[PDB]
Enzyme design. Structure first.
Site, PDB file in Angstrom:
ATOM      1  N   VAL A  96      41.647  40.571  45.429  1.00  0.00           N
ATOM      2  CA  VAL A  96      41.189  40.896  46.769  1.00  0.00           C
ATOM      3  C   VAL A  96      41.389  39.768  47.769  1.00  0.00           C
ATOM      4  O   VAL A  96      41.003  38.617  47.522  1.00  0.00           O
ATOM      5  CB  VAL A  96      39.696  41.278  46.736  1.00  0.00           C
ATOM      6  CG1 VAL A  96      39.238  41.743  48.118  1.00  0.00           C
ATOM      7  CG2 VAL A  96      39.476  42.358  45.689  1.00  0.00           C
TER       8      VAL A  96
ATOM      9  N   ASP B 134      28.909  52.040  39.229  1.00  0.00           N
ATOM     10  CA  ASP B 134      29.075  50.586  39.127  1.00  0.00           C
ATOM     11  C   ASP B 134      28.257  49.874  40.197  1.00  0.00           C
ATOM     12  O   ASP B 134      28.703  48.897  40.798  1.00  0.00           O
ATOM     13  CB  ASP B 134      30.554  50.186  39.230  1.00  0.00           C
ATOM     14  CG  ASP B 134      30.801  48.736  38.797  1.00  0.00           C
ATOM     15  OD1 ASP B 134      29.965  48.186  38.045  1.00  0.00           O
ATOM     16  OD2 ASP B 134      31.836  48.151  39.190  1.00  0.00           O
TER      17      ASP B 134
ATOM     18  N   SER C  11      42.089  44.146  39.871  1.00  0.00           N
ATOM     19  CA  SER C  11      42.734  43.810  41.129  1.00  0.00           C
ATOM     20  C   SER C  11      42.475  42.412  41.654  1.00  0.00           C
ATOM     21  O   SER C  11      41.684  41.650  41.097  1.00  0.00           O
ATOM     22  CB  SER C  11      42.281  44.801  42.195  1.00  0.00           C
ATOM     23  OG  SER C  11      40.886  44.677  42.411  1.00  0.00           O
TER      24      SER C  11
ATOM     25  N   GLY D  64      38.270  37.482  46.428  1.00  0.00           N
ATOM     26  CA  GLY D  64      37.641  37.998  45.231  1.00  0.00           C
ATOM     27  C   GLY D  64      38.635  38.501  44.212  1.00  0.00           C
ATOM     28  O   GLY D  64      39.847  38.351  44.373  1.00  0.00           O
TER      29      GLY D  64
ATOM     30  N   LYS E 199      38.930  42.798  37.080  1.00  0.00           N
ATOM     31  CA  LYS E 199      39.928  42.899  36.026  1.00  0.00           C
ATOM     32  C   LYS E 199      41.004  43.908  36.410  1.00  0.00           C
ATOM     33  O   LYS E 199      42.038  44.004  35.751  1.00  0.00           O
ATOM     34  CB  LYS E 199      39.284  43.278  34.684  1.00  0.00           C
ATOM     35  CG  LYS E 199      38.318  44.444  34.718  1.00  0.00           C
ATOM     36  CD  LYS E 199      37.800  44.723  33.307  1.00  0.00           C
ATOM     37  CE  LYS E 199      36.578  45.620  33.326  1.00  0.00           C
ATOM     38  NZ  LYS E 199      35.447  44.971  34.047  1.00  0.00           N
TER      39      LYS E 199
END
Ligand SMILES: O=C1CCCCc2cnn3c(NC4CC4)nc(nc23)Nc2cccc(c2)N1
Length: 328
Positions: free
Chosen positions: A48, A151, A46, A41, A44
């Protein structure tokens, strides 16, 4: 002047060390302890990857951070440490950094997640009630710990459908709640932003997550992803108004003495409230029960103070079976 109706004094009563995240002194582990297997994944902020702990040969998730301010990174870490162990809260296992570049990575537990875009359409009526209840446990817990996630969205809810395990992830936008504090409204994601953010009401609270949760819930029962499909922030607000009606919006704005930008007010216009049943169809009919609708309606309210708290949400009759199964 707005304040949370619950858990308002959590950070007030706890020692300053709990919320004064800038006083945090990060203890770094060994960066070679975790090997990258593959990218899974990104954000904006990081990159993953699926990784492996070279010690126990167990899976883990490596979140490599892009250049980020010291203050911001200490906040995510402190929050993760404060919540580690809570019901369905993702677990931060280690914190490492590359010596030469100073690039930090946060190591987390691994979850065999299934893309929500593929998973949700297969969820049964009960599955939805089940997983939402699980997500609620995470929200009431963090809220009770004086923390706003800010979030909430399908992307931040990892689910291993086989093990029926759920984890609320990515606390990079989370913040500690302090009565009366004015927060940045540039949080949450497109489609899940609460009206308080869209109208610039900065003294928001835990209730913001409940709107996001409602958006998520709406998408699930109505089989419409996302439920509020808007482009920019102005459009996102217009999309909400054409469903909830502008009367509620005006009453809302008046209560908190908020004035919309002229251009925005023009875009929003005037709209009547559209009953939740107007969204029912042969595709979602097997999910739009009156209990589901009642619960949703109590979540999606302009006035953040009117929304159900996570604790209240969990006791709603809509979840009665989930609870009965748990209390046994
Ligand atoms: O904060 C984070 C890292 C979450 C680590 C927990 C975590 C646990 N599993 N997991 C999975 N499992 C999928 C591979 C099977 N993906 C992501 N994060 C996680 N992806 C992801 C993608 C973008 C951003 C984040 C996380 N954000």
């Amino acid at each position: 002047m707005s304040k949370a109706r619950v858990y308002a004094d959590v950070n007030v009563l706890r020692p300053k060390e709990y919320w004064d995240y800038e006083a945090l002194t990060v203890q770094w582990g060994e960066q070679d302890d975790y090997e990258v297997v593959r990218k899974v994944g990104r954000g904006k902020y990081s990159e993953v990857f699926e990784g492996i702990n070279v010690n126990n040969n167990e899976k883990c998730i490596i979140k490599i951070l892009k250049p980020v301010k010291k203050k911001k990174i200490k906040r995510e870490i402190k929050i993760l440490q404060n919540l580690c162990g809570g019901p369905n809260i993702v677990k931060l296992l280690d914190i490492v950094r590359d010596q030469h570049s100073k690039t930090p990575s946060l190591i987390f537990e691994y979850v065999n997640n299934t893309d929500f875009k593929v998973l949700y359409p297969t969820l049964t009526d009960y599955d939805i009630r089940y997983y939402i209840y699980e997500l609620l446990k995470a929200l009431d817990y963090c809220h009770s710990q004086g923390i706003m996630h800010r979030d909430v969205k399908p992307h931040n809810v990892m689910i291993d459908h086989e093990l029926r395990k759920l984890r609320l992830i990515d606390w990079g936008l989370a913040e500690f709640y302090h009565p009366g504090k004015e927060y940045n409204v540039r949080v949450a994601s497109r489609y899940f932003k609460g009206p308080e953010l869209l109208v610039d009401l900065q003294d928001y609270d835990y209730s913001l997550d409940m709107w996001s949760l409602g958006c998520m819930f709406a998408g699930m029962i109505f089989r419409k992803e996302p439920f509020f499909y808007g482009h920019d922030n102005h459009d996102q607000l217009v999309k909400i108004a054409k469903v909830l009606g502008t009367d509620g919006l005006n009453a809302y704005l008046n209560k908190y003495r908020i004035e919309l930008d002229p251009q925005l007010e023009a875009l929003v216009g005037r709209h009547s409230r559209k009953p939740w049943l107007k969204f029912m169809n042969a595709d979602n009919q097997h999910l739009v029960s009156p209990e589901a609708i009642d619960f949703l309606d109590k979540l999606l309210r302009y006035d953040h103070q009117e929304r159900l708290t996570a604790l209240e949400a969990m006791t709603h009759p809509y979840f009665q079976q989930v609870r009965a199964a748990e209390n046994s």
